[model samples]
Target: HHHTDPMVSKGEELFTGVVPILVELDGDVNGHKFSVSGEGEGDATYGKLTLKFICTTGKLPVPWPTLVTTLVLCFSRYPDHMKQHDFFKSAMPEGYVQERTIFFKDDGNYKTRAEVKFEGDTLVNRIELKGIDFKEDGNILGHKLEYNYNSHNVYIMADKQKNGIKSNFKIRHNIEDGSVQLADHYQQNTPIGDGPVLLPDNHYLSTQSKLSKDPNEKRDHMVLLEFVTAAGIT
Candidate 1:
């Protein structure tokens, strides 16, 4: 008689349909040339691990470039509850919890901290981006990104600042039902200390697996994402 390891079986189930892939996104945002490309393995599993991410900006100055870049990176790496089970099994051989911090050379001040833990049969993963600062002329701006996920859902939030403008972005994704909700708010502080000016807010909700079925969902502050298979499926 032969027996199968429950952890291995869970790992397999977590990555059942996942495959390695390369993602490339190239376009213009408000006349600013933007291009992003990355290659990595895993899907919602293991939080969309990216071996490398190359992002290029255009000649024109854009507000909150660091914030946008960090947000895109976090979106790709956001863990899927189904995929996290496999990651937890492999990451917890000696202990049930682990945490690590990663510093990036692209920006000396930028860093990320990731934590993974197990709660009974459920797995939880949290990733936080800190010390994201951008310098433009004499102004110094900053932003923060966070991602938290468990067996049921994932929550993401970002606070961004550029010059006197500030924005708060939030996203919630339901793992079991494949639903998503996003809210973004922007505001600007008056230099004269009168009052803050409120800008338009963006909100999105999707109840299905697909984010958008309509092609005209483009907006001024939206970023397009594309995913392609890196290798031929055998």
Candidate 2:
């Protein structure tokens, strides 16, 4: 997934979709569109998907289109007949396969899979949103922030240009723990999305794990896309 930008440059990685804080991010929270009103069919048992971003007023030092967050939450309803596997136990693996981990290193770009690296409760700082990639639309900006997603929920994210893009300069934080807490194994310990047996009944779209750089380097830090599809066994 590639596109245009403000400086006439192409697109890049922006951020990793952390949990908890992702919950506060206004998108598909509590099974509703943060962008619009009312509950769509996507929010019920199949959790929700949402995107939150900071609008740049051209004051920041990093390149634009490098700070986007796409929260893909499947409010699992268990389509029909599938295995009743423990969706809570389903994970990407430590190297690469399912979902990407929050803790990243220099060599992390080539690796895939989900890692249970960090753990926490209600306290802060346990989570992180590493700026990874960006894809600003030649079209619409999310609020003052410019970002976009694709036809089948493929998240096209990035950072804001430093010239004129601006946001309210709101305080930033990560909600990775919050999301993990909501997962079946974490705290609430309830299963909704996937398990194993029910995986066949659902649909999960697969995608390339996005690529991200250092945001402080004055470059784009948008990471890879969470491109994957799944049919679960709930």
Candidate 3:
């Protein structure tokens, strides 16, 4: 009796497939060429996506020792499915705050999880880094690094004795152009000392995505990232 039903006819035309994606990051880190390559696949209908990116640079020659070797990004509407993974246990409903444990390939093989909090209009206002350590010139620097928007500075503390070494970087972000700058300030017991320093003011790093109109233009220490997608079969 339902041979000519419109709903039944439309249901017969439903199809399923897979979508392939490519992500890349090419840039220069402190005068050294740095790049990342990633490939992923997703469901065509429900949009369950999984991606894994790996840095091409084995070990950075620069002083910045916190380079991640493998990065994973997964998206799913059902939080229960993602919870099966160890790193994706902290996945949320709105997906605003993502807790990820990033691993490094340096000498100590450090591992740390980052909790970045987003406020109104999806702007990151607070960042908490756990179990973070920096090793430079065969010496461990900071034991932990943390930042808060209300404080307006990024703090790095070392685990020495009762009163250890503490330093902060006054961060200023240009909301209009999306550029960020961190002014360094070192503090000891008396607020000034020439002892071991984390990173000098001259070595501070800044990045902006819109530094040039043309992407191919050569600039000093420029970074570029791109994501491409294509239809494929599962």
Candidate 4:
């Protein structure tokens, strides 16, 4: 008999029926051209969006062009009961959780802000741009998204504005059984395709991490109690 690994199954489930049909971006700083694109698979997302500095003429300071040139994109969907972790938070609340974030050069501090709000039977995920504190004059241009997640419904709307001209997009999906349900407004076939966009290899993994100190490190404080951890899965 062949046993199945839940992590592998979970990873595969991440992009089975994602579809990215609405993506757009425009305008730039210091004359640098900007672009945007993304992939969608039901509740999972992985793709590229945002711009990088290739010239010093823009508001970005020196060393901007010398750093990595691509932004990383990712999204998450989880049950409201998802705990921050067993070690940190005491408990997890019940509701749906969804997040969409983008990072500049894969740096944590240089990422967009994703905030969540929950009501009786609905959840809202708000993603917005902000300034890069480390890099003076650095700014995340006019892009924003409001995504709705629930046990039986899902929808997302993205928008960008330049000098008062507006660009917008919308997509919807079903989530009760974890399946795709493209809405009527979106055509069945197109360049956006019927599946999620592919991302750079291992793009989902973060370069930085936080972990609890080894219990054995404080031998005088606490007695050993057979400590164990589920590697990587955490």
**lDDT of candidate 1 over 113-217, digit per residue (tens):** 333333343233333444433332212122222222212222222122421222233323222235332223222221222222122122111111111122453
* Model 1 per-residue lDDT at 36: 47
Worst 10 residues of 1 by lDDT: 203-212
What are the runs in model 2 whose C-alpha is more than 4 Å off? 1-42, 50-77, 83-126, 131-146, 152-203, 206-234
> Per-residue error at 168 for model 2, in Å?
35
Please give, for residues 1-234, the per-residue lDDT of candidate 2 as tens digits.
122322111101111122332221222111222221111122212333322223222233322232222222222222323212213212211111123222112211111122221123110111122322212321112122222222232221111221111111111221223211010110111222232111212234222233344365442223223333334324
TM-score of each: 0.27, 0.27, 0.24, 0.21
Pick the lDDT winner: 1
Model 4 over residues 34-153: C-alpha lDDT tens digits? Answer: 333222122222221222112212333212211121111122322122211111011111211222222332222222332222223222223332323222332222211111221212
**What 10-residue stretch in candidate 2 is worst by lDDT?**
180-189
Q: Which stretches of candidate 3 lie over 4 Å from their true place?
A: 1-103, 116-118, 123-126, 130-135, 138-233
TM-score for candidate 1, residues paired by index: 0.27
Off by over 4 Å in 1: 1-5, 17-108, 114-126, 138-215, 218-234
Please give, for residues 1-234, the per-residue lDDT of candidate 3 as tens digits. 122533322211221244454545443432445554545454423424444444556542322223221121222221222122211112211122223243232322222222322123221212233333334432223212121111232232432452222333432322223433232233222112223212211111111111112355332221222121211112
Q: All models: lDDT?
A: 0.29, 0.22, 0.28, 0.23
